[PDB]
Structure formats: structure tokens, C-alpha cells
Amino acid sequence: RMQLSEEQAAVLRAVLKGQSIFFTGSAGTGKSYLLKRILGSLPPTGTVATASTGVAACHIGGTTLHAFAGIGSGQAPLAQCVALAQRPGVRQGWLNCQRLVIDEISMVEADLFDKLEAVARAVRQQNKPFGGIQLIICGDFLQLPPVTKGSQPPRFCFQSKSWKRCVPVTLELTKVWRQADQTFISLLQAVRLGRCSDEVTRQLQATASHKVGRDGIVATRLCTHQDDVALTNERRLQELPGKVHRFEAMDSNPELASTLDAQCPVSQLLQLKLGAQVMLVKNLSVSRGLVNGARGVVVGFEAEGRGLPQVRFLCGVTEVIHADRWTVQATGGQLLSRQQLPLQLAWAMSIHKSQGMTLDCVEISLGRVFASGQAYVALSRARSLQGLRVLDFDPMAVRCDPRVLHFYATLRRGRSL
Ligand SMILES: Nc1ncnc2c1ncn2[C@@H]1O[C@H](COP(=O)(O)OP(=O)(O)NP(=O)(O)O)[C@@H](O)[C@H]1O
Ligand SMILES: CC(=O)Nc1ccc(-c2csc(N)n2)cc1
Ligand SMILES: CC(=O)Nc1ccc(-c2csc(N)n2)cc1
Ligand SMILES: [Mg+2]
Incomplete structure (x- = not known):
């Protein structure tokens, strides 16, 4: 195993202390590699590895967030999504999930995050953010933007009114490894x-x-x-x-x-x-x-x-x-x-x-x-x-969405650098 940077070690520490976290960083900063190290450091029981997309799920040996949730497209009314999540096999996956890993968070739209958060609470019958699941989320909002199964312009995941309550801690990886130059x-x-x-x-x-x-x-x-x-x-x-x-x-x-x-x-x-x-x-x-x-x-x-x-x-x-x-x-x-x-x-x-x-x-x-x-x-x-x-x-x-620049500027407001 490679030597984790200090930044990478800090994220791992938070995860093993049971803290829900978002961690972010430029392309090639080792976000997905660190997810693999995190999964290796956790008991496999109660830990679910997902990503926003099938291609990204492959990089970490996980499943899609769609496949884990089992709520169809997520466009149906919440009550129908809850009923779908209550199906055999699906239900157990929700009940048994203590830690949910999500890579490439930037493709998940806010409306879907809101829906999953509510489903988590309904199925597990736990009146806490995201049903009390420990969320371990990473990606880069300045990478690929949110998609939707609907027809409305999607909001970024961080626009969800539940985002900050569900992922109260944010850490950054700042050293690019993919490129050496x-x-x-x-x-x-x-x-x-x-x-x-x-x-x-x-x-x-x-x-x-x-x-x-x-x-x-x-x-x-x-x-x-x-x-x-x-x-x-x-x-x-x-x-x-x-x-x-x-x-x-x-x-x-x-x-x-x-x-x-x-x-x-x-x-x-x-x-x-x-x-x-x-x-x-x-x-x-x-x-x-x-x-x-x-x-x-x-x-x-x-x-x-x-x-x-x-x-x-x-x-x-x-x-x-x-x-x-x-x-x-x-x-x-x-x-x-x-x-x-x-x-x-x-x-x-x-x-x-x-x-x-x-x-x-x-x-x-x-x-x-x-x-x-x-x-x-x-x-x-x-x-x-x-x-x-x-x-x-x-x-x-080359376009950056202003909402994302504003998000990042708010995120770093209290930081040293
Ligand atoms: N501590 C480390 N020391 C050296 N190389 C590392 C370290 N952490 C990660 N890498 C390498 O960095 C490269 C990019 O890692 P990767 O996990 O794909 O980054 P990422 O942040 O997920 N990229 P992206 O998905 O494109 O935003 C890989 O070749 C890793 O082996
Ligand atoms: C889950 C999934 O669909 N993965 C995936 C990844 C890469 C490619 C690929 C490489 S070169 C080319 N033309 N297409 C296709 C599919
Ligand atoms: C929640 C957080 O950490 N920051 C944040 C940043 C931007 C937005 C946003 C962009 S335009 C709009 N209506 N909402 C919401 C929240
Ligand atoms: Mg990655």
C-alpha cells in the first residue's frame, strides 16, 4: 500500500471516528483511491460501496446508487418510492446499511438526494438525517454536472436543503498525483x-x-x-x-x-x-x-x-x-x-x-x-x-457553473488557506 498523504490520512481518521463527511478535490487527487483504502479499513458488514454512475462504480468495486436505493427512477411520488424500497432484498439493504459510500457525487441531483434522504428515514424508521446512516461522500463539483431522470434543469447536490445536515464535515485533497508535471x-x-x-x-x-x-x-x-x-x-x-x-x-x-x-x-x-x-x-x-x-x-x-x-x-x-x-x-x-x-x-x-x-x-x-x-x-x-x-x-x-464557485467560496470561508 502507498503512503497516504496527511490530507488523505485526515479523511480516513474522520471516517473511522464514525463522522459523516464529504471530501473533495481536483481531478487526480486520489479521492477514489482513498475510498478503496477506506473500504479496506472498515468491516464489510454494514458498509455499502456506491457511485453515481456505473462507470464510476467499477473503479471502486461498488454498485450504482440507483441499484442500491431500489426506488425505480426516483421520479415516482415519495410514498411509491418508499413502497419500492420496502421490497424484499431492497429493504434489507436499507436496514443493514450503517455506512454508505458515494463516489462522483457531482452527478447526483439535489432532488434525488432529498428523495433518498426521506426514503432512508421512512424505511429504517429512524428520525435522524438520512435515517442515521454514516455518509462517506466524495467527488468534485467542478467536474461532471448533475443529471436528471426528469425534465427539469437539475440542481447540484449541495443545493439540497438536507446537504449540510447530512454531511456536516468537509475535507479537501489538494495534491494532484495523476499528472507529475x-x-x-x-x-x-x-x-x-x-x-x-x-x-x-x-x-x-x-x-x-x-x-x-x-x-x-x-x-x-x-x-x-x-x-x-x-x-x-x-x-x-x-x-x-x-x-x-x-x-x-x-x-x-x-x-x-x-x-x-x-x-x-x-x-x-x-x-x-x-x-x-x-x-x-x-x-x-x-x-x-x-x-x-x-x-x-x-x-x-x-x-x-x-x-x-x-x-x-x-x-x-x-x-x-x-x-x-x-x-x-x-x-x-x-x-x-x-x-x-x-x-x-x-x-x-x-x-x-x-x-x-x-x-x-x-x-x-x-x-x-x-x-x-x-x-x-x-x-x-x-x-x-x-x-x-x-x-x-x-x-x-470552459465553463464553471456560478453556483459551484459560490459553494466552494462558502466552503473555504473559515479556512487557513
Ligand atoms: N498517497 C498517494 N501517493 C501516490 N499516488 C497516489 C496517492 N493517492 C492516490 N495516488 C494516485 O493518484 C492517481 C489518481 O487517483 P484517483 O483515485 O483516480 O483520483 P481521483 O481524485 O479519484 N480522480 P478523478 O476521479 O478523476 O477526480 C492514481 O494513479 C493513484 O494511484
Ligand atoms: C460501466 C460502463 O459502461 N463502463 C464503460 C467504460 C468504458 C467504455 C469505453 C472505453 S473505450 C469506449 N469506446 N468505451 C465503455 C463502458
Ligand atoms: C449548502 C452549502 O454548503 N452551500 C450552498 C451553496 C450554493 C447554493 C445554491 C446555489 S444557487 C442556490 N439557490 N443555491 C446552496 C448551498
Ligand atoms: Mg475518482
């Missing part, structure tokens, strides 16, 4: 706060000339919408001359495939060719650089058996990629599994799917208005400036 760290920090000076703008524009690929590997284009990702990956695959090689997943419940898809980074049908640009979506070997996010290209298929792909990675290593398995925790503690190769096509990927990840071979076009925090998320995935190529950069792409 101070120039790049300082550049990302300016973007995160919406402060694009002439110098910042010039620096990002200069990346347009970066050749980020090496030896037949090309940059993954980060896109705002999955439609555009799917179309790009399919068209680039189709244009390759080789025969198609197919790898069909085996699911424990094929019928529930769609529930699996939301919490699992691999598809039912994987199609590959010589030359296919692929991303490894599971940590295989940290030492050999075979980690989640690693980019490579298919350099052959084995002659024998299933004809598994041989993949040359940007790092250097060339390796035959074997089947792996994901076991997802759905509603009411139901478990579903998928066996598949841990590969996705990677000429393109959505910014939402990169949430929480480190990447190192990325291109993005930043000349349009984006959602608050979305340009920052995209840029802050890259380990290094030289693995990033930004096209058509314009500060219009």
Missing part, C-alpha cells in the same frame, strides 16, 4: 476554475501539433455523446481490410443483459480486426502497464482455439488478451455476470465513460460550448501533456 497541473487548475489567461489558451492551442500516437496506435477521440462514439468506432473498424473476428460474451442472465451493460465496460459482441484500435478496460497487471485505460492496437490473432487477439500497447508490451469476468450488483442484491475479453474499440470514447479514469493517448475538439466541468474532465484524464491533442481550443468551451 507542474506545468500541466497549473494549466489544469486554471481550466478547472474557468481562468483561461492568454498564456493558458496559448498552451492548450499549442497541443494541436502533438503527435500523440506511436507505431500504429492513434489517439482516442473524446466525444460528448455516445451516438458519435459508436458511429466513429464502427466506421473505422469497417474501413480496415482484414477479416472480422467475433467474440461473444456469456452472461449468467442473457435476458438482463441491459442491466449488466450499465455497470460493465464490455459489450455482448466484440468485433475485432488486424489494426483495430482498442482500450483495455480492466487492470490486468500494474507492473506490466496493463491497466484500465491502456491503449493498443490488434497486431494478430492466435492460430489455436478461440483465436484470441494479440495486442501491442503504447507502453511497449505485446500480449495475448484472454477472457475476463465482471460480476455486477443489481437491485435488491441480485448478482449478474458477464464473461468477455476486457477490450472496447477505442478510436472514440464518450467523456462520460472516461469519468474517474486516467488516459494517455487522447484528442478532443474544444471549440463549442460544453457543459460546466466537461472540458475540464476531458483534459484532466491525460497523464501527460504530450499524450493530449486539443483541436480548435477556445475558452468558450
Whole structure:
């Protein structure tokens, strides 16, 4: 285990003292890593690991907050949500939960937080904030903004009238680890706060000339919408001359495939060719650089058996990629599994799917208005400036929601620095 910073240790201390806490910090400050250390330090009984999204839940071995709550979409009236939470399996999960971990809190809208808080009280019959559950919450409100299952403009989670009562303590992680380069760290920090000076703008524009690929590997284009990702990956695959090689997943419940898809980074049908640009979506070997996010290209298929792909990675290593398995925790503690190769096509990927990840071979076009925090998320995935190529950069792409700046300014009002 790595040596926790003083900041990271302080959060761990609070959690083990039984304090409900929100902890926050820039991209790559080790929030999710610290969640893993927290989960290891707690009894597994009574501790529930969630995140706002399926992609983020994977990073910590958890489930989605949606799946844990078991209140359907959460759009139904509170009384109907309570009844849903009273269902077998669901109910027990609420009753037995003493500590609830939530990563990537920035995607949870205030109305949903309010709903969960009320459900917690109703189901557990405990007249205390959040049913008396110890909340352990982290993320960055200057990253991806709240989504909604409804049609109204969402409020940030901190706008809930229950936020401060439910998470009375706030701590910060301030040392970025993802990037090693101070120039790049300082550049990302300016973007995160919406402060694009002439110098910042010039620096990002200069990346347009970066050749980020090496030896037949090309940059993954980060896109705002999955439609555009799917179309790009399919068209680039189709244009390759080789025969198609197919790898069909085996699911424990094929019928529930769609529930699996939301919490699992691999598809039912994987199609590959010589030359296919692929991303490894599971940590295989940290030492050999075979980690989640690693980019490579298919350099052959084995002659024998299933004809598994041989993949040359940007790092250097060339390796035959074997089947792996994901076991997802759905509603009411139901478990579903998928066996598949841990590969996705990677000429393109959505910014939402990169949430929480480190990447190192990325291109993005930043000349349009984006959602608050979305340009920052995209840029802050890259380990290094030289693995990033930004096209058509314009500060219009970089927006911070004023509500979030006000939140952060209020949060630090009494602090030393
Ligand atoms: N104490 C530490 N010492 C050294 N490296 C660390 C430490 N804590 C975390 N890291 C590394 O920091 C990197 C980023 O960690 P991660 O947990 O993804 O950050 P994050 O704050 O969750 N990122 P994001 O989800 O993008 O906001 C990982 O490669 C960790 O190994
Ligand atoms: C839970 C979940 O859906 N995870 C996930 C993560 C990454 C990707 C991915 C990588 S490259 C690409 N085109 N898409 C897809 C899915
Ligand atoms: C609760 C807390 O710690 N701070 C906080 C910050 C901002 C807002 C907000 C933005 S505009 C609006 N109507 N509400 C609410 C609360
Ligand atoms: Mg994270």
C-alpha cells in the first residue's frame, strides 16, 4: 500500500471516528483511491460501496446508487418510492446499511438526494438525517454536472436543503498525483476554475501539433455523446481490410443483459480486426502497464482455439488478451455476470465513460460550448501533456457553473488557506 498523504490520512481518521463527511478535490487527487483504502479499513458488514454512475462504480468495486436505493427512477411520488424500497432484498439493504459510500457525487441531483434522504428515514424508521446512516461522500463539483431522470434543469447536490445536515464535515485533497508535471497541473487548475489567461489558451492551442500516437496506435477521440462514439468506432473498424473476428460474451442472465451493460465496460459482441484500435478496460497487471485505460492496437490473432487477439500497447508490451469476468450488483442484491475479453474499440470514447479514469493517448475538439466541468474532465484524464491533442481550443468551451464557485467560496470561508 502507498503512503497516504496527511490530507488523505485526515479523511480516513474522520471516517473511522464514525463522522459523516464529504471530501473533495481536483481531478487526480486520489479521492477514489482513498475510498478503496477506506473500504479496506472498515468491516464489510454494514458498509455499502456506491457511485453515481456505473462507470464510476467499477473503479471502486461498488454498485450504482440507483441499484442500491431500489426506488425505480426516483421520479415516482415519495410514498411509491418508499413502497419500492420496502421490497424484499431492497429493504434489507436499507436496514443493514450503517455506512454508505458515494463516489462522483457531482452527478447526483439535489432532488434525488432529498428523495433518498426521506426514503432512508421512512424505511429504517429512524428520525435522524438520512435515517442515521454514516455518509462517506466524495467527488468534485467542478467536474461532471448533475443529471436528471426528469425534465427539469437539475440542481447540484449541495443545493439540497438536507446537504449540510447530512454531511456536516468537509475535507479537501489538494495534491494532484495523476499528472507529475507542474506545468500541466497549473494549466489544469486554471481550466478547472474557468481562468483561461492568454498564456493558458496559448498552451492548450499549442497541443494541436502533438503527435500523440506511436507505431500504429492513434489517439482516442473524446466525444460528448455516445451516438458519435459508436458511429466513429464502427466506421473505422469497417474501413480496415482484414477479416472480422467475433467474440461473444456469456452472461449468467442473457435476458438482463441491459442491466449488466450499465455497470460493465464490455459489450455482448466484440468485433475485432488486424489494426483495430482498442482500450483495455480492466487492470490486468500494474507492473506490466496493463491497466484500465491502456491503449493498443490488434497486431494478430492466435492460430489455436478461440483465436484470441494479440495486442501491442503504447507502453511497449505485446500480449495475448484472454477472457475476463465482471460480476455486477443489481437491485435488491441480485448478482449478474458477464464473461468477455476486457477490450472496447477505442478510436472514440464518450467523456462520460472516461469519468474517474486516467488516459494517455487522447484528442478532443474544444471549440463549442460544453457543459460546466466537461472540458475540464476531458483534459484532466491525460497523464501527460504530450499524450493530449486539443483541436480548435477556445475558452468558450470552459465553463464553471456560478453556483459551484459560490459553494466552494462558502466552503473555504473559515479556512487557513
Ligand atoms: N498517497 C498517494 N501517493 C501516490 N499516488 C497516489 C496517492 N493517492 C492516490 N495516488 C494516485 O493518484 C492517481 C489518481 O487517483 P484517483 O483515485 O483516480 O483520483 P481521483 O481524485 O479519484 N480522480 P478523478 O476521479 O478523476 O477526480 C492514481 O494513479 C493513484 O494511484
Ligand atoms: C460501466 C460502463 O459502461 N463502463 C464503460 C467504460 C468504458 C467504455 C469505453 C472505453 S473505450 C469506449 N469506446 N468505451 C465503455 C463502458
Ligand atoms: C449548502 C452549502 O454548503 N452551500 C450552498 C451553496 C450554493 C447554493 C445554491 C446555489 S444557487 C442556490 N439557490 N443555491 C446552496 C448551498
Ligand atoms: Mg475518482
